[PDB]
Amino acid sequence: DVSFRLSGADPSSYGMFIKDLRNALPHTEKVYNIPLLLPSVSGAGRYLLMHLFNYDGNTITVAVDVTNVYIMGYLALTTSYFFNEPAADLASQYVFRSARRKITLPYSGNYERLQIAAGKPREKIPIGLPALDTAISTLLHYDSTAAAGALLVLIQTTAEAARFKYIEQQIQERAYRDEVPSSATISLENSWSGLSKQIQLAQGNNGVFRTPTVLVDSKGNRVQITNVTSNVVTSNIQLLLNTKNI
């Protein structure tokens, strides 16, 4: 498992958590020096448990699919909660067996749907370590509308920071003040699968993407990523979604 405590949290211990989370995702191979997530994993080995504690020290456990870093659901005291999607239903066979009841959220895990349930797109939802404290607090008691927003916080501050060093750094910047995600943050999250695919296809195209990926950069400007020498590939991206799952 991996754990993260908001109590006493600073950029450094959040950095330790994101490293532990990355280290808990298995791989047999690196492609341009980036771990390649597995095509699949059978049984309960497929899910990582992240124990998250808010400032007060109350806790949820979040089940994460180790092949794609998708959050599947979570446990809050004696109740499990899963996304309304077949992968999550499948996960519910293996994790949080002991929960007194299992609630299916009234939405799937994707950003479009979640932004609809929450009432705001991501661009307008502040993230940060305080927002992550809020989200834990929210998930501890069922409220599907609130939960959508809390899940949008939780996905970005865990999975998305695991995937990209830049996003991890953005969150370290808001260790004590939330702020809506930068344009680059949103662009990177939206491009992970596209990027993961092009990096893998470059492997026999001399490092050249077959299709250039458009991103917004750290300065807010619209770049074209055409090859693996780009700093998005050399510095930023930390995990690749296997093309077998694309």
Ligand X SMILES: C[n+]1cn([C@@H]2O[C@H](COP(=O)(O)OP(=O)(O)OP(=O)(O)O)[C@@H](O)[C@H]2O)c2nc(N)[nH]c(=O)c21
Ligand Y SMILES: *[C@@H]1O[C@H](CO)[C@@H](O[C@@H]2O[C@H](CO)[C@@H](O)[C@H](O)[C@H]2NC(C)=O)[C@H](O)[C@H]1NC(C)=O
Q: Which are the catalytic amino acids?
A: 160
How far apart (Å, rounded) are the C-alpha atoms in residues 206 and 58?
50
CB crowding 135-160: b at 16 or more within 10 Å, else e: bbbbbbeeeeebbbbbbbbbbbbbbb
Q: Binding residue for ligand Y (CB under 6 A) from 208, 217, 218, 245?
A: 208
Nearer to ligand Y, 144 or 231 (CB): 231
Q: Which residues are annotated as a binding site for GMP?
A: 70-71, 85, 111
Within the chain, how many helices (H) and strands (E) appear?
9, 10
104 binds ligand X (CB under 6 A): no
Q: Return the axis-axis angle of helices 165-173 and 11-23, rounded to nearest 10°.
A: 150
Task: Identify what 72 binds: ligand X, ligand Y, none; CB under 5 to 8 Å per kind.
Answer: ligand X
Q: Binding residue for ligand X (CB under 6 A) from 23, 40, 84, 110?
A: 110
Task: Identify what 155 binds: ligand X, ligand Y, none; CB under 5 to 8 Å per kind.
Answer: ligand X
Reduced DSSP (H G I as helix, E B as strand, rest coil) percent helix, strand, coil of the chain, to 5: 45, 25, 30
Task: Identify what 227 binds: ligand Y, ligand X, none; CB under 5 to 8 Å per kind.
Answer: ligand Y
Residue position matching structure tokens 């809050």: 76
Residues that bind ligand Y (CB under 6 A): 208, 226-227, 229-230
Residues that bind ligand X (CB under 6 A): 70-72, 83, 85, 87, 108-112, 155, 159-160, 189-190, 192-193
